[PDB]
Amino acid sequence: CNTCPEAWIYFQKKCYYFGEGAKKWIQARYACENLHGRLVSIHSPEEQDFLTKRANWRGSWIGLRDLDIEGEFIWMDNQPLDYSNWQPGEPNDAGQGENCVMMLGSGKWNDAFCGSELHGWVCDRLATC
Ligand SMILES: CC(=O)N[C@H]1[C@H](O[C@@H]2[C@@H](OC[C@H]3O[C@H](O)[C@@H](O)[C@@H](O[C@H]4O[C@H](CO)[C@@H](O)[C@H](O)[C@@H]4O[C@@H]4O[C@H](CO)[C@@H](O)[C@H](O)[C@H]4NC(C)=O)[C@@H]3O)O[C@H](CO)[C@@H](O)[C@@H]2O)O[C@H](CO)[C@@H](O)[C@@H]1O
Ligand SMILES: [Ca+2]
Ligand SMILES: [Ca+2]
C-alpha cells in the first residue's frame, strides 16, 4: 500500500505535503486538514531524515504543540513523545510564550510563538492501497 495523492511524497506508509507560503501555525493546521491530512507527526529518526532533506530551509511548522498544558507537547496523531530532535536548549518557552514547534533549517526543533508567520509547513497522511 504505497499510493499518495498528486503533489504528495511517499515515505514509509505515510504521505507528506511540503506546503510553501507564509502561515501561522493554526493556519497550517487548517491547511493540512483542508488537504485531508494533519500537520506532520514525527516518530523516528528515519522519518525525520526524510523530512529534513525536503524541508524548507527558512523553517516550517510541524504537528507538535503544548497549548493544552504548558510544557507537555502533543503530536497531531496523539501518539507518544518518544522520538525527539530538540535543538539544544529548546524548548525554552521564550518571548512571551512559545507553544508551537517548528523545524529549523537543520531539522532540529524549536518551540515558537504560535502567531509567527513561517514560510513552510508539512502535512502527513496515511498511504492507501
Ligand atoms: C523585549 C525587547 O527589548 N525587544 C526588542 C528586541 O530586543 C531583542 C530581543 O531579543 C529577541 C531574542 O532574544 C533572545 O536572544 C532569544 O530568546 C531569541 O529567541 C529566538 O531564538 C531562540 C534561540 O536562541 C528561540 O528559542 C526563540 O524561540 C527564537 O527563535 C526564533 O524563532 C523564530 C520564530 O519565532 C524562527 O523563525 C527563528 O528561526 C528562530 N531563531 C532561532 C535562532 O532559532 C529572541 O528572538 O529582546 C532582548 C531583550 O531580552 C534584546 O536584548 C534583543 O536585542 O529588539 C527589537 C529590534 O531588534 C526591538 O524592536 C524590540 O523592542
Ligand atoms: Ca509553551
Ligand atoms: Ca524557542
Tell me the resolution in Å. Answer: 2.7
Q: Is residue 1 part of a domain?
A: no
Amino acid at site 13: K
Q: Is residue 110 part of a domain?
A: yes
- Contact (Cβ atoms closer than 8 angstroms) between residue 73 and residue 114: no
Residues 6+ apart with CB under 8 A from 5: 15, 36, 125
Which cell numbers in the block locate residue 40? 506532520
Rounded Cα distance between 74 and 64, Å, is 5
CA–centroid distance, residue 67 to ligand 2 (Å): 7
Give how many domains the chain has, as a whole number.
1
Q: Is residue 2 part of a domain?
A: no
Q: Is residue 18 part of a domain?
A: yes
Ligand 1 proximal residues by C-beta, below 6 Å = 59, 90, 92, 94, 98, 104, 110, 112-113, 116
Side-chain half-sphere CA neighbours of 14 within 13 A = 20
- Contact (Cβ atoms closer than 8 angstroms) between residue 77 and residue 39: no
CA–centroid distance, residue 99 to ligand 3 (Å): 9
CA–centroid distance, residue 64 to ligand 3 (Å): 13
Tell me which method was used to determine the 3D structure: X-ray
Domain of 30, CATH number, reads: 3.10.100.10
Rounded Cα distance between 116 and 85, Å, is 21
Domain span including residue 14: 7-127
